[PDB]
Structures are given as structure tokens and as C-alpha cells.
Amino acid sequence: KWIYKFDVLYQSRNPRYRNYEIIRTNVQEVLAEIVSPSTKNPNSENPAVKKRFRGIKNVVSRIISNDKKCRYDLIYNKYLSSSDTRKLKTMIDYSTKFNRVVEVVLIIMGKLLPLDAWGGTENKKVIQDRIVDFLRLGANERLHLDDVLSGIKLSKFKWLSQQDFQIRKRLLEGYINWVFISLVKNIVRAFWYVTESSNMDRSKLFYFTHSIWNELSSNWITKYAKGNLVQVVSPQFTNGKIKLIPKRGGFRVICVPLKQSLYSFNNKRNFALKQKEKWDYIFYQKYTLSPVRQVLQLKLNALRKSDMGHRSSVNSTNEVADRILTFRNDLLKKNKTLPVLYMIKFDMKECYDRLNQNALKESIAGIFKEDNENTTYHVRTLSISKNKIIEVCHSQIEDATCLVKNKEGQYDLFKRKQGVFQGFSLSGIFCDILYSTMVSKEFKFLWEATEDNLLLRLVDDFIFITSNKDTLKKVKDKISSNELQKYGAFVNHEKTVEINGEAGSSNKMTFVGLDINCLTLDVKKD
Ligand code: NA
Ligand code: NA
């Protein structure tokens, strides 16, 4: 509940390890952090505390000296160099193994802290185990200080109610806190870019050396920017910071929205903006962005109970199984026994990147077609007009800007050629509006006499089940053509799978981790 892990993540560097220093503060600055972390004025304490300053200063001075003497360039070459420029199949295989991360961190701690700074031999093992625990923490996990101190013998820290034994405790709390916050965290940020994988669990962190991470990220960005981005030398909250997340062979490109303007982000520490800009973002989120996100979702649900075209969009794996079993029971009413069924699954290539912006605007306009320009809406009450919806959506689509941190620590700007950024507040609902509009227009023949046809959309994955072999031909014709490219939906033809119940080497199909039997329509998990 005291020592956090998230603030070591996503730290990109370009370090020179020859003549490198972990501790950037002097001995007096550290003494303030240990003794009075809140006030940062240790001279105000009563003399029972100040008499311990010399013993604390000498220990810190030895740690600071050991830091200046430590040859981190040699430690990197021996343990982290890995100078083998061949390629690997998965990105997380470029990361340093977790055992090697622990070994590097504990070796540096051994070269920084003398035995008496650890509190003796027995306490050194205890603190080392707690350092490993901190390294095993997930992105949203934390470690409590009293958890660390519960295994520490205070009496062994000779350099330091009677009020003597209460001062020793507080000094131990402040010192141990300084070890984790300022030494252990700075060691991690000095050698690794810490991030989580696209494999959902955030409790599994991966540690990439800054040398290999800068090569992998920059190579991917220059590739990705060619087909998706346009550099802007030019400049409501439409700016974001690019964040790459390793995905099996490549990266997932995420644009984390800036909660400030580009001015407050540029300068390091202008505070006269930060506190007031916070309110500008809150009022935009509460009174502009949320009503837009709600009215868009409400209009979508309104077409989710009026038209079959939008009815075909689902949101979870279990929701697919529920609509399939319902489709099975609907067939067991028209036939009294399951007929021969035909199944096909297909998916779109990079639905968010290839999304056609012009067709998206027509879709958003299409769901506000029965309203006048003066129309107003009320949400849980908050007021917002149809025009304000269109204005917010157009700025999110057309004015989206991302910041890419390149090799030398600079910051270049980019807009999108087509598509929408992942991570923006309306990107998901945008893709839902466009794809539902596409399914409602292009697959209109399915919705006539729907008692023998089933189409389901998990956002970029499609499954189609039918008892009509002719209708299966119409669906195969629609996806094999390029008529869906108008919307930016490019069928991934290599992953299009088709099975049916007449014959064939298989009667099973896995779609979202469900295992579907085209004979019985029984669906189990995979
Ligand atoms: Na120093
Ligand atoms: Na088959």
C-alpha cells in the first residue's frame, strides 16, 4: 500500500553507461528525503533526531561514492549486451529473462550498499527478497513498507517511549523507502523499458534493454507511419502520445490521449497550467465527451432493436454462444430436426487502421438522419445538441494527432492517412457504427426471412451459419469481392475458413475460442 510499481513502466532512454550515476542527488538532498520526506527540512527536527545525521550522512556518502565508482558500462556488457543482431519470431523474446533482471539489479545493489548499509548479513537477505518481490509486481500492484520491515531486525542498524526507539523506526522507514523509491526504481528505469504484452494479463511485465527497444520501436514506427501516418509541422483534446505494446510478431499501436494541450506538455514543469488545465479536461470529459459517447451508444441500441443489420453485432464470447443456441432452437421449430448447415468465418485486416473516414462520417450522419439540426438530447440531466455531436466526432476523426518519441529523445507529430487511433475515447464506438452500418447495407439479403440465416460480428471477427446453400454463395461473393473496401473493411482472405455438414475432413470450427459443431450446433469452449 506504500511502494508502487507502475511508475517504472514505459520509461524510454538513450543512456551512456560509461560514467553513469544512479543517484543524481547529493548527500544533503538524500538526508532530507530520509529524515523529513514531507517537509524536506531536516534541520527543524529536535536535537534527538539531528544527532543521528552524521551516521546517516556517512552511509549515504559511501553509497554515493560507490555509485560514482561503479562501472555500469562493464555490467551491461557482461549481462545485458546480447550483441546478436539476428531476428526472432515473437517480440517478447527480445526481452531480458526475469532471472537476469533480478541478477543485474541485485549485483548493482551489492556494489552500492555496504554490509552495514544492508543492516547486517541476515537483513541483507531479507531486503534482497523484498527487492525481488517488487520486481515480480504487476503494473497495478504495490508493496507495503511495513511488509518489508516485518522481517528486519532494527537493532542491527547501528547507525540508526524513550523516543530513541521511535526515531530509529522512522529513520529506518525513510531509509528503506529511499532504497526502493530512489535506488531500486532508478536501476530499473536505467536499464530497461518496462511494458506489458498484448496478452491481457498486466501482472506479467517484460523488461527490454533500451538498446533493443529503441531499435524495435523505431523500425516499427517508420514502417507503420508509411501506410498510416502523415507528419504535421502544424499543431478539443485531439493530441495523444504513441505507445507500442508487443503483440506476437509485432506491436499494437496505442495512442494515449494527452490530458493537456501541446503547450502544457511541451514545457517540463509549468504548474500554472497543470492545475487549471485539469479542470478544462474534466469539464470536457463530463459535459462534452460523455454525452457524445452516450447519445452515440443510445442511437446504436435504438437500431439494435429495430433493424436486423445492427442486430448482428455482439460484444462477448458468451454472447455468441447464446445467439447460436437461440438460432439452433429457432431451426428446431421450422424443421423439427437439424438440417444440413453451412458455416463460414472471416475477419477484417486492421479494422482500426484501415477504417474509411469518409464512410465513417456518412455512417454517423446516417444514424442522425431522422433528427433536425436543432435537435437536442438529454442523458443521465445533461444537454447536448446533434450539431455538437457531429462537431466532436469530426474533430476526433480529422484532427487526431499523435506524438512519436524518436531516437534522440525528440517529439514528432503525425496525423492519420485513414482510420482512427486506438485509445481514443470514441474509436470503439466509431468502428461499431461503421461496421454495423456496413452489415446492414451490404448483407441486406440475409435479413429477408431470417429464420434460416445467422450472422454475428465480434468487432472484426465474423461468423455466418445458414441452412441455404444459395445464401452461402451470396455471402462468399460479397466477401471475395472488394465491395466491402469502400468502408475500409479488407477481408483477410488467408484466414477465411468454411465448413459444412455435407462432407469434409472436419465438422468443427473455432471462432472466438468457442468450438462449434456444424452438425449438432453444440458449442463448447476451447
Ligand atoms: Na551523485
Ligand atoms: Na465438413
Side-chain angles (χ1 to χ4, degrees):
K1 314 304 200 171
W2 253 93
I3 300 178
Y4 292 82
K5 181 58 170 287
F6 66 95
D7 70 300
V8 314
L9 272 61
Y10 321 122
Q11 238 72 74
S12 58
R13 304 263 197 272
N14 200 88
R16 176 200 184 90
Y17 290 137
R18 176 66 185 105
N19 290 117
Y20 187 91
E21 290 185 19
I22 295 292
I23 312 170
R24 306 290 175 84
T25 53
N26 62 73
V27 58
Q28 255 290 353
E29 288 168 312
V30 174
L31 181 71
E33 215 178 332
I34 299 178
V35 169
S36 302
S38 53
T39 72
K40 301 220 108 64
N41 183 27
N43 310 88
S44 169
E45 309 288 337
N46 80 101
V49 187
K50 299 178 71 176
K51 62 180 181 180
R52 275 117 166 174
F53 286 174
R54 289 161 160 178
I56 301 170
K57 274 181 174 177
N58 286 0
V59 165
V60 175
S61 295
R62 295 156 66 199
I63 297 174
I64 293 180
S65 172
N66 293 331
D67 181 53
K68 291 184 168 62
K69 306 286 196 308
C70 191
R71 286 265 292 194
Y72 297 104
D73 62 305
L74 268 35
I75 299 181
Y76 175 83
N77 298 338
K78 188 179 178 181
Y79 295 101
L80 301 177
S81 189
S82 298
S83 54
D84 177 53
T85 59
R86 78 179 176 91
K87 292 180 180 179
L88 290 79
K89 292 196 173 186
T90 53
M91 301 304 302
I92 61 174
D93 287 352
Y94 285 97
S95 71
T96 309
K97 295 182 178 180
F98 189 80
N99 283 3
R100 186 51 55 87
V101 177
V102 172
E103 182 169 51
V104 167
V105 171
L106 294 191
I107 278 175
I108 295 173
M109 296 299 301
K111 286 189 163 60
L112 294 177
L113 276 63
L115 182 54
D116 62 280
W118 288 96
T121 166
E122 301 296 338
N123 286 328
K124 180 178 182 178
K125 280 121 64 179
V126 176
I127 300 179
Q128 281 177 330
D129 294 321
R130 302 292 82 85
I131 292 176
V132 177
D133 285 354
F134 171 81
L135 295 173
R136 290 176 180 169
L137 292 178
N140 44 25
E141 307 196 61
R142 52 184 180 172
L143 185 69
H144 196 278
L145 238 182
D146 300 336
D147 186 20
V148 180
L149 300 189
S150 54
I152 286 182
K153 285 188 54 179
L154 216 192
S155 65
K156 293 273 188 171
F157 289 79
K158 295 183 176 182
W159 49 284
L160 317 182
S161 171
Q162 187 179 320
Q163 113 231 355
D164 282 0
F165 301 98
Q166 287 291 335
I167 289 168
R168 290 172 167 95
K169 298 170 189 176
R170 295 182 178 179
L171 295 177
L172 180 60
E173 295 175 11
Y175 168 71
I176 291 299
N177 199 92
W178 175 76
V179 172
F180 278 81
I181 272 71
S182 295
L183 294 178
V184 180
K185 286 189 182 187
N186 280 330
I187 294 172
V188 179
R189 294 187 275 249
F191 291 95
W192 297 282
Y193 175 100
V194 186
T195 189
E196 73 283 358
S197 178
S198 195
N199 179 255
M200 314 236 311
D201 188 13
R202 293 182 180 178
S203 180
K204 172 67 172 179
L205 291 170
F206 295 91
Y207 300 77
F208 303 88
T209 66
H210 291 106
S211 181
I212 196 60
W213 174 259
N214 293 336
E215 181 191 347
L216 297 172
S217 64
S218 66
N219 289 7
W220 181 268
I221 288 300
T222 59
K223 254 185 52 186
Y224 175 87
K226 285 179 180 176
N228 301 274
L229 303 181
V230 277
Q231 149 108 43
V232 282
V233 203
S234 305
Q236 229 297 324
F237 293 84
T238 58
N239 306 328
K241 189 192 299 182
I242 285 297
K243 170 181 171 181
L244 302 193
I245 297 176
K247 196 169 65 179
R248 296 93 35 174
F251 289 104
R252 199 170 198 263
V253 168
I254 299 299
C255 188
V256 183
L258 260 59
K259 280 75 184 178
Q260 321 161 112
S261 67
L262 202 50
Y263 183 84
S264 177
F265 183 87
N266 199 9
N267 190 270
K268 291 182 178 179
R269 293 178 180 178
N270 284 345
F271 183 84
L273 295 144
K274 231 297 181 178
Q275 211 275 320
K276 280 118 286 295
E277 282 239 61
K278 172 196 176 187
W279 296 113
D280 281 356
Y281 182 77
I282 293 174
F283 272 65
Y284 175 78
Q285 201 76 25
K286 186 177 233 303
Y287 297 100
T288 295
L289 210 51
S290 292
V292 170
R293 196 189 310 108
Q294 293 181 43
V295 171
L296 284 173
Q297 186 63 69
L298 293 175
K299 281 289 185 178
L300 214 60
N301 290 336
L303 292 167
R304 178 54 134 73
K305 303 174 183 176
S306 71
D307 256 308
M308 291 294 183
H310 310 254
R311 184 72 155 267
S312 72
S313 51
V314 298
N315 305 102
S316 58
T317 291
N318 268 92
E319 197 174 342
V320 170
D322 295 3
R323 283 213 60 188
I324 283 181
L325 295 175
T326 305
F327 176 65
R328 192 192 76 183
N329 296 344
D330 291 311
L331 290 179
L332 294 185
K333 300 176 179 181
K334 188 244 272 285
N335 304 91
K336 297 180 179 180
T337 169
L338 273 190
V340 179
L341 294 177
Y342 300 81
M343 308 205 306
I344 182 175
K345 72 175 192 185
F346 54 95
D347 63 316
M348 301 305 175
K349 293 185 286 190
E350 315 142 50
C351 54
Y352 290 98
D353 291 297
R354 316 287 283 273
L355 211 76
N356 191 286
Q357 295 185 9
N358 280 344
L360 172 57
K361 299 172 190 173
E362 297 185 15
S363 299
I364 299 177
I367 77 176
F368 294 101
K369 63 186 178 69
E370 302 172 48
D371 298 302
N372 190 253
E373 295 180 347
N374 308 282
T375 313
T376 320
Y377 304 86
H378 294 85
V379 293
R380 299 178 176 179
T381 180
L382 298 173
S383 182
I384 188 148
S385 63
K386 167 189 171 182
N387 267 71
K388 187 62 174 179
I389 309 288
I390 305 298
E391 295 172 17
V392 168
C393 293
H394 271 58
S395 75
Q396 288 279 318
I397 299 162
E398 307 168 312
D399 307 331
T401 306
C402 71
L403 285 136
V404 182
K405 193 172 181 179
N406 60 316
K407 303 178 181 179
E408 314 89 342
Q410 308 173 13
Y411 266 115
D412 292 336
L413 290 175
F414 291 94
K415 283 191 176 182
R416 295 205 61 87
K417 291 185 176 180
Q418 79 283 325
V420 297
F421 284 110
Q422 299 185 72
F424 271 44
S425 61
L426 296 187
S427 294
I429 187 71
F430 283 166
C431 183
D432 214 302
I433 289 173
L434 181 63
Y435 273 13
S436 292
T437 294
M438 174 183 60
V439 170
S440 188
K441 294 188 190 298
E442 300 299 318
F443 294 94
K444 70 281 170 185
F445 52 89
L446 303 182
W447 321 129
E448 305 157 359
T450 66
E451 67 278 330
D452 43 13
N453 297 312
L454 174 65
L455 178 60
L456 296 180
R457 183 180 68 81
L458 208 35
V459 286
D460 65 329
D461 294 316
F462 294 77
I463 184 135
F464 176 72
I465 306 180
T466 184
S467 81
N468 193 328
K469 193 170 179 57
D470 294 317
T471 303
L472 177 72
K473 187 222 187 307
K474 303 189 189 69
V475 165
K476 288 178 58 182
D477 291 0
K478 178 69 68 177
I479 68 172
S480 68
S481 71
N482 304 336
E483 292 170 57
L484 296 187
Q485 298 187 4
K486 305 156 45 191
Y487 308 85
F490 295 79
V491 178
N492 206 335
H493 292 139
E494 68 192 53
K495 290 196 294 185
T496 297
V497 179
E498 173 184 350
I499 76 168
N500 59 72
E502 308 179 350
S505 57
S506 176
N507 297 327
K508 307 279 170 51
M509 166 178 293
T510 50
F511 177 56
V512 281
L514 302 173
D515 192 78
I516 308 169
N517 188 339
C518 67
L519 300 182
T520 70
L521 234 44
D522 295 354
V523 42
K524 61 183 177 181
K525 280 72 191 301
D526 211 66

